[PDB]
Design a protein around this ligand. Structure first.
Ligand SMILES: Nc1nc2c(ncn2[C@@H]2O[C@H](COP(=O)(O)OP(=O)(O)NP(=O)(O)O)[C@@H](O)[C@H]2O)c(=O)[nH]1
Ligand SMILES: [Mg+2]
Lengths: 36, 161, 176
């Protein structure tokens, strides 16, 4: 049961590292995207 | 011994019904029970005149509690003496009912009793103007039970500091 | 369609997680509040235009996750910010304590001359107040920050908060 949250935390790390990179990129070019 | 919880069906139905057509009227079944069983005993203090003012202030959301980083001590009380209960304790919080009449000193025990009631009204109000969307009825119910549990304990002199 | 604006000011929201940044944003920009609002993922901004000294100001309010240490995506966040709303929770003293740490990031990663306003939010919780107004206003005055208490929930001073920081930015940008 505890091996699922350890691997599920490595997944979150990966998703979040992705969101950071892409958001950084989006601002370096077309920040218009991040508007509500 | 294990710690469990089961909703009292009588209480559950009373609430689930009130949520569907929420009112702040003191005389409805839902609030009346809580008024008599929880609120009234909680807001019962030595100086009963000021106490009844606080009860009205709480219902109006006009009551406020500040910590303390020209008046006198007969009405307001002071740092070493609580205004609500005649007790002598270090008072680290002070109450304001206005529109402030005066700033009144409060013992930690009083603060716990009053906030417990203010928390109840606060959540109830959130529902009346709800404002409570993503929480299902079972969760909300058990929130009210929690809110009451706090008042039930403060009622009896069990508080947190 | 007249969408014109005379000045475009970027203002960033900073402060401890849960002080209500995202709701200050929604309250000002779309007059909406969410009691159940969740933690902010990624980075966003919404815009609103106002009149200041006859000139129209288009405000660009940026918001991001209140949890910040290792983000490194912060350089981009503060870049071009001419104003900052530094937010704490009146009812959680810890969030006021960390205001100093936030001033650090501003003095490190953000431009100087950036207008900084201290905002005490959740003024609507009257019985829970942990940070007396005077102590904050004092800290604000000595540290060169504006100060106001807002409630995203009942709307008090939210409008006022933005009108204030936006006009202080006007005066500095028009003068130089
Ligand atoms: N009573 C009250 N609650 C508020 C107020 N503003 C926000 N909240 C509540 O505080 C919680 C956090 O709000 P949120 O806007 O998400 O804060 P945040 O700073 O954006 N969080 P994050 O930094 O993690 O994105 C929510 O439950 C929200 O409803 C306010 O003015 N009054
Ligand atoms: Mg947020």
């Amino acid at each position: 049961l505890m091996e699922a949250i350890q691997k599920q935390e490595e997944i979150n790390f990966r998703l979040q590292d992705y969101i950071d990179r892409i958001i950084v990129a989006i601002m370096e070019t077309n920040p218009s995207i991040l508007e509500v | 011994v294990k710690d469990c919880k089961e909703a009292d069906l009588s209480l559950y139905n009373e609430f689930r019904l009130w949520k569907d057509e929420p009112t702040m009227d003191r005389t409805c079944p839902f609030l009346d029970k809580i008024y008599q069983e929880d609120i009234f005993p909680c807001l019962t203090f030595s100086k009963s005149e000021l106490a009844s003012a606080v009860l009205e202030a709480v219902e109006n959301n006009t009551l406020s509690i500040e910590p303390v980083g020209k008046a006198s001590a007969v009405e307001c009380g002071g740092p070493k003496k609580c205004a609500l209960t005649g007790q002598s304790k270090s008072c680290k919080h002070r109450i304001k009912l206005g529109d402030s009449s005066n700033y009144y000193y409060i013992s930690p025990f009083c603060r716990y009793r009053i906030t417990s009631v203010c928390n109840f009204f606060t959540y109830i109000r959130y529902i009346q103007q709800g404002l409570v969307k993503q929480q299902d009825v079972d969760q909300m119910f058990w929130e009210v039970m929690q809110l009451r549990k706090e008042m039930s304990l403060a009622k009896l002199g069990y508080f947190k500091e | 369609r007249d969408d014109e604006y005379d000045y475009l000011f970027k203002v960033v929201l900073i402060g401890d997680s849960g002080v209500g940044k995202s709701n200050l944003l929604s309250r000002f920009t779309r007059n909406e509040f969410n009691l159940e609002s969740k933690s902010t993922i990624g980075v966003e901004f919404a815009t609103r235009s106002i009149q200041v000294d006859g000139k129209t100001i288009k405000a660009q309010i940026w918001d991001t996750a209140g949890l910040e240490r290792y983000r490194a995506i912060t350089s981009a966040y503060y870049r071009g910010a001419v104003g900052a709303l530094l937010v704490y929770d009146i009812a959680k003293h810890l969030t006021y304590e960390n205001v100093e740490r936030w001033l650090k990031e501003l003095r490190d990663h953000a431009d100087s001359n950036i207008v900084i306003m201290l905002v005490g939010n959740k003024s609507d919780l009257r019985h829970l107040r942990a940070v007396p107004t005077d102590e904050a206003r004092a800290f604000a005055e000595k540290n060169g920050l504006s100060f106001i208490e807002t409630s995203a929930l009942d709307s008090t001073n939210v409008e006022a908060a933005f009108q204030t920081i936006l006009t202080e930015i006007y005066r500095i940008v028009s003068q130089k």
